[PDB]
Write a structure and sequence with these properties.
23% of the residues lie in helices and 18% in strands. The chain has 39 residues and is α+β, with helices and mostly antiparallel strands. This is DNA primase.
């Protein structure tokens, strides 16, 4: 079929900005699991 588009608002139980920055930079320490709050 076609790729279904989803817009997922996500939150983290710690510092979300720092965790996201570490995730984008492929850093080892700093990444935490993400909770998809609403979509």
């Amino acid at each position: 079929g076609t790729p279904v588009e989803v817009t997922a608002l996500y939150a983290t139980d710690g510092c979300v900005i720092t965790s996201s920055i570490a995730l984008l930079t492929n850093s080892l320490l700093g990444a935490e699991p993400v909770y998809i709050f609403s979509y």
